[PDB]
Design an enzyme around this catalytic site. Sequence first.
Site, PDB file in Angstrom:
ATOM      1  CG  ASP A   1      -1.901   1.088   1.258  1.00 49.89           C
ATOM      2  OD1 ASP A   1      -2.844   1.030   0.441  1.00 49.89           O
ATOM      3  OD2 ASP A   1      -1.754   2.010   2.090  1.00 49.89           O
TER       4      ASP A   1
ATOM      5  CD  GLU B   1      -2.091   1.894  -3.680  1.00 49.06           C
ATOM      6  OE1 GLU B   1      -1.773   2.110  -2.474  1.00 49.06           O
ATOM      7  OE2 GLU B   1      -3.236   2.114  -4.131  1.00 49.06           O
TER       8      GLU B   1
END
Length: 810
Positions: free
Chosen positions: A511, A540
């Site tokens: 994340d 990400e």
Amino acid sequence: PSVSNAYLDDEKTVLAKLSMPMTLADAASGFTVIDKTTGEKIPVTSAVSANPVTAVLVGDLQQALGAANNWSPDDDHTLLKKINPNLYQLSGTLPAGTYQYKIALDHSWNTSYPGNNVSLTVPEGGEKVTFTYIPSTNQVFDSVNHPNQAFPTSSAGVQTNLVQLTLASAPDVTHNLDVAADGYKAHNILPRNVLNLPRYDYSGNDLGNVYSKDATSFRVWAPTASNVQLLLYNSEKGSITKQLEMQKSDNGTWKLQVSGNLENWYYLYQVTVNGTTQTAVDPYARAISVNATRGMIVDLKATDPAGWQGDHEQTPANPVDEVIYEAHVRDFSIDANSGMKNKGKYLAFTEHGTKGPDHVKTGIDSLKELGITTVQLQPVEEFNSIDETQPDTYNWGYDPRNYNVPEGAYATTPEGTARITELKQLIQSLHQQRIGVNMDVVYNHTFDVMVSDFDKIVPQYYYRTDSNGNYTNGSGCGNEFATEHPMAQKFVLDSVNYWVNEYHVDGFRFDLMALLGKDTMAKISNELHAINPGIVLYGEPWTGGTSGLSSDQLVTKGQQKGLGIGVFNDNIRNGLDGNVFDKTAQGFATGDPNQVDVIKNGVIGSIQDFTSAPSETINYVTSHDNMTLWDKILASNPSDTEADRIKMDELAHAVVFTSQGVPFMQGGEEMLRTKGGNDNSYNAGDSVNQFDWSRKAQFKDVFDYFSSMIHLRNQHPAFRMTTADQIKQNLTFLESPTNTVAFELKNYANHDTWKNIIVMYNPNKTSQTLNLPSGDWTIVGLGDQIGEKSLGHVMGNVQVPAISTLILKQ
């Protein structure tokens, strides 16, 4: 009037913020530091401004000094270098002639010095010239106009509200340290970057508790604590059973060996830092009381399910060999129609033979049918948002609290070690079906600060703070984890090693990975690949807010090159269905005519966009964030028929499944899962988020189309080349009609059993024709039929139906 914050950022360096600016004087400039514990005064030997200065030499001499253009304040080619805090200089050799210059600040013409352009004549033969800028006076000199001009070694005169202080001796980081200046209220000095130093760096592998039948040993890093005690409880909710002093040990750690069998006992650390005592759960705890009031000491061996010694990892040769399916543990099975008994639980993934509406396979049998290789689980590391006594509240889990403990809400009980055994059973089950498990992990921030175990043990140090002493907001959730701090980085490295070693997980989705930093991701990749080179790591390449980390370290697209990690490809995503900001935006799959080049760049695994190898791009069109594709297409294409919208959805995924790189899909897209238009469903509940398995019955043709595409990729390694050179050698784009993309995979690419493969995407509402290379072509994908079998043979030219993908082979 006050010192509003102060940090000890090196052994003899304090960074202090003032509530209003001051003009600095000589030496100490009125600053004092006292150790309030011992009463000892520590002399301040130097006081300079901590504000950076960006001073660039500008003029018609800039090109002659290597800059692209003259009169350019933002060209750091002629950026002046810090000689001392009040002396900035640049030297360079200039050819003979007349020049003009100034010093421009902060990459603009807003402020430049001196008042006018300065004339500089360079004599016959040329000369090396030194250019000088003095921050205190804004004075500008050169060595030709002022040959032996005197330059100061004092910061007297500089105006600032942020001061860097040098101390005569190194203070004790466990003591009560204070800083003051004349006319300013005093403030505590909190240790910060001083703790980076090797003397506070513990490299042992025993942080946490280490259980044996005869004794348990405890170790915690608390370099600023004056005292640490161990609190032992022989019950989950009852009062303290035994309170024991721990012993100061190596590099800021405290340790204790406790004789006896502490299996199923609970514990806390009681930590005294300067003026206060609090209790904390061990950040390294492997189990907890309900709601993590306490850590729990357990025998990990006893938690292994039967058959665990026979478990085999599911890590392929290269990340491009995975087809990743994102799923939340509750969503997967919670629906009354799911056919699974353990609804919303890890154990639902162990259930064979489960059936849904109209006898569709559900659960693991559905995953098997579909052909995906790897399940990416939404966060299963213990998070704060669900009260374990009310385990049916809904959350995605992006608020982690206990990084090394499985989420209790997904276990049949939050008591004891059932959560450990049951998650292992999930992983075991998937492995038995040759399906891997990648964990979504949220190391970039914690659920909160101040009340977090991190802040109760080593105040602020696990988080990023600015020069005002405020927590920076890199995650968008109020804090960010400081991976540039060695022991914070070690915490993350130890954690991912633990999850792989104890739970046999096959990879990680990070994340907001950009926040973790390049150096950290390189170390994660290197450590985990040393265990198993097939472990797949990605995340990400963006942040959730303004980060404290320098942009040079943020893992944005391009920064992953050569690191053995991948990034979610928002370029291909936006190219497929339109920019994420505009709900009504169309893309390649849904009618926008301007995306062909974007799609071509995605087809080749991004090797001309931001990757060095196709394993570095995670190709996708949707995820748990934003809208499901079915909902998105309803928003952008409200006037199109159901039948055409189904074709567009299938086409977007066909691009993902046939492009070089790592294909990823949001679980449930194969049955047109709908959130009723919700674009951020993190706490929206089951009616919004669940797998409604009736939609697999309703859209079985869509499910079958997805399955046929996935199985084709699995069977044909030409779709899964592993290097940029292979792709450049074997993949060629073919001339095709406006707003279509056609390519050929040649030469039995990457040991394919098919010599040549042609793929063409036709997003248009009319059929389109493709001119073919020489020879007989076998149609294997046409309209709604995709597979290994001949659908007919053609030569010369072929028609591709509206909104579809053509596949041929020779």
